[PDB]
């Protein structure tokens, strides 16, 4: 199980050379400068922000959603109603003699129903993503990937989404509840996700169960 | 799902300055708040106890 | 489903500045608070009861 | 799975300073709040007892 | 009863891409503005 | 059960790579712009 070969997280070399420097030109000067990889034109008191593809942007996921419903309604009836001669005069004898007249009925109605519902979810973390695309109005679609392996699994939170270049704070940072299109994934393998699973009859039964 | 309708008839002279009326300025208000699903159909009386509820002597 | 019904006489000099008038000033008040579904049949009496409230001896 | 899902209508004159608005100043505001995955299928009824809070008498 | 087709409640597309911008006036003047209504 | 091969939420590549910067124009100013949007 442990001797079965794996695929680390990270893959390739994890150290590289220096690359020695180039040879100093002849010209009287010190001060030589490596083959220049121009950047383009960067403000200088604008706050950093992404401009282009494969500029980073920090996501502060911070998700706080609570929705509940309620409701109930009943109905109640009782009747009652008796009529008694205990003793009856003579002339009414013939009209409520030998119990003819008494009676004595009983009823009643009852119904109680409710019901309610209720899901809530939040979600609080820091990721660092890429701008892969730039709008027609400015706006940068994101996408970004962390992956975790502590010991015994393998986490991903992925994230995706559409961020207003307004919204991001002087820190290069926004909140994740100003991104339009936000998909959130948190994820992970390993026997400890297996674990979560149910097992196949059960779900079976869940789902083709008569109660 | 739940469903809140209304309608009616609104004086513009009740609205306030932030665009709002109270429900109680509404000439023919209709105010409607329903639902659908097991939750609804569980505050259902049974169609017996409904025919008992309207038929029985008591 | 409930139903508020109003019918009256108003004196125009009764209403006050906010357009709001009391029950009390209007001369024919005719006021109606009823509904219906099965709350309302719950608290109708059977037929029987009632044929017995309206002529029992007692 | 969770999804949240809205639409609506919103007037410009009603959004804040800060690209803000309060979802009960949307005209035709349509809110959905869902979920799939076994949890989800937790919280439906059996098609039996379904039938049941349907079709018995009481 | 979980796997039931259904029609959310929120139908149709749940986003809009942003449409490009009209060509600007060879006019003098860098204010541009759209087809007013 | 964890088997099933399914299709993640986020879906797609998750990196973007930077796409090299134009060809500075031979006039002699320093400043210069991207394709303006």
């Known amino acids: 199980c442990a001797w079965i070969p794996a695929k680390p997280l990270v893959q390739g070399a994890t150290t590289a050379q220096p690359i020695p420097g180039p ?8 001060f030589q400068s490596a083959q220049p990889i121009n ?30 419903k309620s409701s109930s309604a009943n109905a109640s009836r009782d009747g009652k109603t ?3 001669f205990d003793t009856v ?19 009643g109605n009852s119904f109680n129903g409710k019901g309610g519902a209720n899901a809530s979810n939040t979600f609080s973390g820091t990721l660092t993503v890429t701008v892969d695309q730039v709008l027609a109005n ?4 994101v996408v970004g990937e962390k992956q975790i392996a502590i010991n015994q699994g393998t986490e991903f939170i992925r994230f995706s989404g559409v961020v207003n270049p307004r919204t991001i704070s002087g820190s290069n940072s926004v909140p994740s509840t100003q991104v339009a299109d936000a998909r959130i994934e948190y994820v992970g393998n390993g026997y400890i996700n297996e674990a979560q699973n149910m097992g196949w009859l059960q779900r079976f039964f869940l789902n083709l169960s008569p109660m």
């Open 82 to 84: 008796s009529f008694g």
């Open 39 to 68: 950047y383009g034109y960067q403000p200088l008191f604008e706050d950093r922000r992404p401009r282009n593809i494969g500029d980073t942007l920090t996501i502060v996921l911070q998700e706080n959603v609570s929705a509940s």
């Open 23 to 30: 040879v100093p030109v002849a010209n009287g000067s010190i």
């Open 89 to 107: 005069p003579r002339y009414l004898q013939g009209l409520f003699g030998n119990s003819r007249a008494d009676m004595e009925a009983s009823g």
């Open 138 to 141: 400015g706006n940068l679609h």
